[PDB]
Amino acid sequence: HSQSLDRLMNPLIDQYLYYLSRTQTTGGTTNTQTLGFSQGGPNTMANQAKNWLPGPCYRQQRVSKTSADNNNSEYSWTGATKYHLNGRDSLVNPGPAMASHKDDEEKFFPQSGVLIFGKQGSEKTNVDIEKVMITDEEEIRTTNPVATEQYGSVSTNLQRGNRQAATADVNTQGVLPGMVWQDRDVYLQGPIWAKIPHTDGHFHPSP
Amino acid sequence: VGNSSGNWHCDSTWMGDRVITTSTRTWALPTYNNHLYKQISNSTSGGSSNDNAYFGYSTPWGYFDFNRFHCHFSPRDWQRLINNNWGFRPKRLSFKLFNIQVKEVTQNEGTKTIANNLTSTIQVFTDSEYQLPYVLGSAHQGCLPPFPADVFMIPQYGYLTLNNGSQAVGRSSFYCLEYFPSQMLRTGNNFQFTYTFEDVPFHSSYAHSQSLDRLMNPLIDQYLYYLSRTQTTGGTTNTQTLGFSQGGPNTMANQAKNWLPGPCYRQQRVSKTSADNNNSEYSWTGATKYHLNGRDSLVNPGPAMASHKDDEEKFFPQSGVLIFGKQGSEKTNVDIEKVMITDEEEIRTTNPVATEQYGSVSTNLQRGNRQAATADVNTQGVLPGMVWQDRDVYLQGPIWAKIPHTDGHFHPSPLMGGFGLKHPPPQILIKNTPVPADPPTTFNQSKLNSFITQYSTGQVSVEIEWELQKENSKRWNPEIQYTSNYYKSTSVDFAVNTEGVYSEPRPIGTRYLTRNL
Amino acid sequence: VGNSSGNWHCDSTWMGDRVITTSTRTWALPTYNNHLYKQISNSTSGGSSNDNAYFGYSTPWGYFDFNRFHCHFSPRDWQRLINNNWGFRPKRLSFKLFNIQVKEVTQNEGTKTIANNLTSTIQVFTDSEYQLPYVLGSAHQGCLPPFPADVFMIPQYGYLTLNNGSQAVGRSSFYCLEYFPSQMLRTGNNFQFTYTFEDVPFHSSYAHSQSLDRLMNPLIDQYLYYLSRTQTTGGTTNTQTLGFSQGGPNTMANQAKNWLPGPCYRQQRVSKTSADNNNSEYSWTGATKYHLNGRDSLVNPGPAMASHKDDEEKFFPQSGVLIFGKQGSEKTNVDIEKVMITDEEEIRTTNPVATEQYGSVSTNLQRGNRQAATADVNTQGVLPGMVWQDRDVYLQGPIWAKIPHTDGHFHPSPLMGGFGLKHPPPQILIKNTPVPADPPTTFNQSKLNSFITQYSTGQVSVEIEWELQKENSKRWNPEIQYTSNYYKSTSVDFAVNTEGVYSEPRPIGTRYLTRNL
Numbered sequence A: 001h002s003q004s005l006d007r008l009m010n011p012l013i014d015q016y017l018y019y020l021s022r023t024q025t026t027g028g029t030t031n032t033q034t035l036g037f038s039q040g041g042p043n044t045m046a047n048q049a050k051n052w053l054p055g056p057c058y059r060q061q062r063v064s065k066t067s068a069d070n071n072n073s074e075y076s077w078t079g080a081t082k083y084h085l086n087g088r089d090s091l092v093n094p095g096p097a098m099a100s101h102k103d104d105e106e107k108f109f110p111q112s113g114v115l116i117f118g119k120q121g122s123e124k125t126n127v128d129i130e131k132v133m134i135t136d137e138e139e140i141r142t143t144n145p146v147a148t149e150q151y152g153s154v155s156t157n158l159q160r161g162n163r164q165a166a167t168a169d170v171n172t173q174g175v176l177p178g179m180v181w182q183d184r185d186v187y188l189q190g191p192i193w194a195k196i197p198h199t200d201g202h203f204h205p206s207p
Numbered sequence B, C: 001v002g003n004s005s006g007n008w009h010c011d012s013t014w015m016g017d018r019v020i021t022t023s024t025r026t027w028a029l030p031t032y033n034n035h036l037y038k039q040i041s042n043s044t045s046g047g048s049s050n051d052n053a054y055f056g057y058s059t060p061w062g063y064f065d066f067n068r069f070h071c072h073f074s075p076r077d078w079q080r081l082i083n084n085n086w087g088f089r090p091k092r093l094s095f096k097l098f099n100i101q102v103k104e105v106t107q108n109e110g111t112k113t114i115a116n117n118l119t120s121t122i123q124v125f126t127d128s129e130y131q132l133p134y135v136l137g138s139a140h141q142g143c144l145p146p147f148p149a150d151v152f153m154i155p156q157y158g159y160l161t162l163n164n165g166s167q168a169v170g171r172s173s174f175y176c177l178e179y180f181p182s183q184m185l186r187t188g189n190n191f192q193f194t195y196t197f198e199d200v201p202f203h204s205s206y207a208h209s210q211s212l213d214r215l216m217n218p219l220i221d222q223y224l225y226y227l228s229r230t231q232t233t234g235g236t237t238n239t240q241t242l243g244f245s246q247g248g249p250n251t252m253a254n255q256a257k258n259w260l261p262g263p264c265y266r267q268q269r270v271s272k273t274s275a276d277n278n279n280s281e282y283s284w285t286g287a288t289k290y291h292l293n294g295r296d297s298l299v300n301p302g303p304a305m306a307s308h309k310d311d312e313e314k315f316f317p318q319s320g321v322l323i324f325g326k327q328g329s330e331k332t333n334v335d336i337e338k339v340m341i342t343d344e345e346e347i348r349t350t351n352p353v354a355t356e357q358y359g360s361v362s363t364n365l366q367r368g369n370r371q372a373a374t375a376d377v378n379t380q381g382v383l384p385g386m387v388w389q390d391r392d393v394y395l396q397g398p399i400w401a402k403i404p405h406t407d408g409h410f411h412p413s414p415l416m417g418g419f420g421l422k423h424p425p426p427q428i429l430i431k432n433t434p435v436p437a438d439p440p441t442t443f444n445q446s447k448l449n450s451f452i453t454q455y456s457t458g459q460v461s462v463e464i465e466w467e468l469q470k471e472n473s474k475r476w477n478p479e480i481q482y483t484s485n486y487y488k489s490t491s492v493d494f495a496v497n498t499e500g501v502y503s504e505p506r507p508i509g510t511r512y513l514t515r516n517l
């Protein structure tokens, strides 16, 4: 896509919709509680009102292709994202569809969130990184969230005179009405099809 | 030149099962960017943070935007639709542009002279193939005004592309609008265009009269048991046990249910009385906001959720509502008596409150020594068995939005309300064709930058046929209708004041009539 | 007067085997020479040398020139044609002129007033008989701009004849353009004209993947011998002998061939890094230049030849290439970062390098005492058995050229690239018809020299149908496509900058796809 899902507006016009812009009178010496509303505009593109949301997420661990940038521990299995089924854990790999990295971060790839092919004649076990070809799912950063970052932030309490506004990071986010996402790419070396399991329930049965 | 191109049709027709709302207005189109496509970025608009960074293009084209309910329905027609129908959806649209005049303003010696140029044209095309960035549905300004008496100016079309800060990436595209087949129109020519909406679900313009967690028979018990008691009650030494009870008319909360409330993405709860809010700047810090490609954006209005619980009108979710602005209200840091905050409380029956946890889930495995722990669910994606209602519509709010061309979308109903369409009414783009001033008498390879100053005006009609779904309520007592309060006021509501300024006093939704769940 | 004459069509249509590229633009025509035919010569332009001497006439007529590939193809369309087709040629053309306005500027008291004159006309004729000097194909300026958003002014038509210095010879002819049947057009009238191209060879838009001197089987030897050894090798006293070897996979240079490289006319080799060039003014002295009737002219770009050998991008033939200029680049002594020098290196397979000898030939008869001498062939005309490729096309370069009406022409393909045509699209000439100011009230035999100042504007469309020759490559590995580099830039390529100025960053040729020889 040539447009980002969060930049589908007209950059010359403002909106006719307001948003909580200011909560505290700015200065005096004694700035107090207030409520100011602004109209989304070409300068506040982040605060504007949107009709859609990014595709679903299941956060992944972010490893660097340069081993000097990674923590010195064996987290290949410990720090991995893995579903539980009938008492046993399995690696979510490649997992659902998500962008590999943000802008200007080619060196980083989600731990399991990508398809890793092997160069010709590459061995089977503990082969090094110059013996494999790690795919780059970065062309879907427009609709899908980055595999190695929180999906969003949600309010975790009720702010009041004494209690202040707390918020949490959303690592796993199932679909919601209004979401839109793209599916994983295909790869001339990758699979073509997969049988949709014979179950009585399947959501968006794309492999 | 000496013959009108069309007539003024601006009234609604009710045919029982459908209503055709026509609306004519007078517009004015100036020459934008002085006929140039200029590249714009957050740095040209005076720089910004990374969350507000952008890269797009301004074009010399204006565009017509009739994507608001008040451009079509009058406050009376809207009330006649809201009090009698259970649902409605648009069926076909018919846009017409006529009575075009291309005036040529020549400012010489402080004295302004405006004369009509009968030979000048305007180009107007409609992207029926959706090959251009769709800008409508972002709730921008520049709509046919709500009051038919006034004339509006046509907004400028500009689009955005991919960016990496204020810079352009490889995939950033440049679309020349002059590369599409426009239709030159002199005074005397008219533009007609028809469109028929795809099959979209009716907008549920009713509230439910039953709560999703009270759909039982209050006189009968269930034949299903539930863990009622876990500890022998008293003795002195109450110990571990297991008692099961049958759900009944007194334990309505413990009974067994077949359905669950709609999905949630928790919001921060602010009070309309600023003395009840924490004294900090949490407009951006305490907000719920999705992350996309490294930059955060406000979830606003976000997905569909109830505004507050029972008897708490003062509280509203920070972003979870549509906030319109009263007439003439400014643009920045306007106070709360200058806006109209909508109340999405009629969906507390199926949708969870925007400012409260969705549920509680067990976080461990209770045992002899470990005791039962539980967590609060702030964000909850859909699950088999969920049921929810979509956001209301608001006679001042949007009508439709283009469903993004992706290969995956769940329940593509727009979060701002309206009808999600894969092929929405196309964008009608229009500009004044350039008319060069006298060129040199010797050839210069350089493009001509001197133009005759002009702007065009004329009328525009937009007829939309809506399908209705009449209310067949078999209820006994009277319902809740939208009514203008009978008390005497200084000025009538939805009318012009003593200065000729039309104003809509409050935001009117559709959910008035009730229906069972 | 109050009705448009045409619409704005400016898009391409791909039908598999052909592509129809339409392109509408807005023009402006001033009154040239104040409606007079003036005789011009090198002496009126400020005198010159004998090589630059000329004698011609200026006329009050302007002419339309759409002889450039960028007037028809957009950078995207050109890429879709360059990456998928092996050849292309034009089939039919359809020129249309409409929405004409004849404004009348009256400058009184420093205040300029421009009003439309509805009764004024313009004359426009097309020389379909080629009775006028053909001026298009000389790569002049005044083309429909490449970007459709901008308006251009129409160039002035003037022609040259025979001369003897700044003077006219007996055969010098004077052509009055008013002596042809024009077509007066008021506002409201339009000019339509159709043309169908003769049968011209497809333009080979592919590179060869094999070198003309490596078309053998590298595993087999030949059954043909060649003089391999002439002197018994060592002893101490090596003497005269005659040894013959068979060409083989190791002596690929000595093998026998059926073909020869295309013709040559050697060029001087200059380096893009001025520190590598001799410190002298050899722009004219060291140039290759043909002699004609006593005066020298630069062979530029000259016939078709490769620019450099392998791994020598820095070097380019002095005249042997097309040098375009970046946007806004000046006219005189502009530096090398202000131009874009094309690279004709994809034809090193068949054509000899422009800056090297063609071959070596024996210049004497070796004997017992005289030894074998040889010379370097700088200029080599065609010979039976030669094969060569023609110069590339360049989305900014010319499309066609009229083949001169002579009784002898060899391989009439234009040296600047394009399609050589004997009957090229005719020249559409257009001028504003004179409108005299108020004449005396008493008869004066003298022609009226006072005219109403006016200029005309309007739109012009040009539709061309091109026949394509789809690529059927049975190659296994991927080819070389033209692609916009994926890295992030400040501004998109082939797009408008932040000031609305469209610019083509580099010269795009056609030879991307490869094919065997």
Ligand SMILES: CO[C@H]1O[C@H](COS(=O)(=O)O)[C@@H](O[C@@H]2O[C@@H](C(=O)O)[C@@H](O[C@H]3O[C@H](COS(=O)(=O)O)[C@@H](O[C@@H]4O[C@H](C(=O)O)[C@@H](O[C@H]5O[C@H](COS(=O)(=O)O)[C@@H](O)[C@H](O)[C@H]5NS(=O)(=O)O)[C@H](O)[C@H]4O)[C@H](OS(=O)(=O)O)[C@H]3NS(=O)(=O)O)[C@H](O)[C@H]2OS(=O)(=O)O)[C@H](O)[C@H]1NS(=O)(=O)O
Pocket: A157, A158, A160, A163
């Ligand atoms: C960890 O638990 C411990 O801390 C949490 C909070 O901290 S935390 O978030 O960091 O974890 C405590 O939980 C919060 O507070 C609870 C509590 O204080 O009981 C409870 O608050 C909600 O309900 C409270 C009582 O409501 S009531 O309807 O049942 O009475 C309420 O506080 C009461 O406010 C009312 C009020 O303002 O109206 C007071 O009533 C008084 O005025 C009324 C109207 O006034 S008027 O002028 O006459 O018009 C009169 O009608 C009434 O007669 C009068 N009562 S009187 O006795 O003073 O005369 C009442 O006195 C207050 O107790 C909370 O409202 S608030 O006003 O305090 O802001 C209300 N929540 S809120 O409105 O959303 O703020 C909640 O469970 C919880 O709320 S919270 O805001 O989300 O945090 C927890 O209790 C505490 N437990 S502990 O660890 O065991 O110590």
Ligand SMILES: CO[C@H]1O[C@H](COS(=O)(=O)O)[C@@H](O[C@@H]2O[C@@H](C(=O)O)[C@@H](O[C@H]3O[C@H](COS(=O)(=O)O)[C@@H](O[C@@H]4O[C@H](C(=O)O)[C@@H](O[C@H]5O[C@H](COS(=O)(=O)O)[C@@H](O)[C@H](O)[C@H]5NS(=O)(=O)O)[C@H](O)[C@H]4O)[C@H](OS(=O)(=O)O)[C@H]3NS(=O)(=O)O)[C@H](O)[C@H]2OS(=O)(=O)O)[C@H](O)[C@H]1NS(=O)(=O)O
Pocket: B364, B365, B367, B370
């Ligand atoms: C933070 O980590 C630390 O604390 C957590 C818990 O605390 S927390 O929740 O607050 O964070 C610890 O994690 C919990 O406990 C773990 C543990 O104790 O190892 C582990 O428990 C699960 O597995 C245990 C061992 O199972 S086994 O199949 O591998 O052996 C188990 O405890 C064992 O119970 C069995 C049993 O009851 O059967 C005992 O076996 C004995 O009886 C068997 C049958 O008896 S019979 O009469 O002969 O029929 C015999 O066959 C067997 O031979 C005999 N063994 S013997 O050596 O005593 O002779 C066995 O001894 C016990 O160790 C847990 O069951 S339980 O019985 O203890 O309740 C079982 N989980 S459970 O059944 O669901 O309760 C889990 O990882 C975890 O469980 S939890 O309940 O979810 O909490 C963590 O280990 C601890 N680590 S630390 O921080 O590093 O110190």
Ligand SMILES: CO[C@H]1O[C@H](COS(=O)(=O)O)[C@@H](O[C@@H]2O[C@@H](C(=O)O)[C@@H](O[C@H]3O[C@H](COS(=O)(=O)O)[C@@H](O[C@@H]4O[C@H](C(=O)O)[C@@H](O[C@H]5O[C@H](COS(=O)(=O)O)[C@@H](O)[C@H](O)[C@H]5NS(=O)(=O)O)[C@H](O)[C@H]4O)[C@H](OS(=O)(=O)O)[C@H]3NS(=O)(=O)O)[C@H](O)[C@H]2OS(=O)(=O)O)[C@H](O)[C@H]1NS(=O)(=O)O
Pocket: C364, C365, C367, C370
């Ligand atoms: C710049 O000019 C000067 O130098 C050039 C050459 O130098 S350069 O190339 O660097 O510029 C001279 O030009 C070359 O030489 C010319 C020349 O020597 O006259 C001339 O040579 C060609 O013709 C010569 C005469 O031919 S003839 O048929 O007219 O007689 C010839 O030399 C003669 O060779 C014959 C021969 O070998 O047959 C000799 O004849 C003798 O034998 C014959 C057969 O023998 S057999 O055993 O009986 O069977 C007998 O029949 C004959 O009776 C007998 N004659 S006898 O008098 O000795 O008894 C004859 O004597 C020779 O003169 C050249 O052949 S060659 O044998 O010398 O190799 C022949 N060219 S060749 O055969 O292709 O080599 C040419 O014009 C030219 O030739 S070249 O090889 O291309 O260079 C130039 O003359 C000189 N002029 S100057 O500057 O004014 O001093």
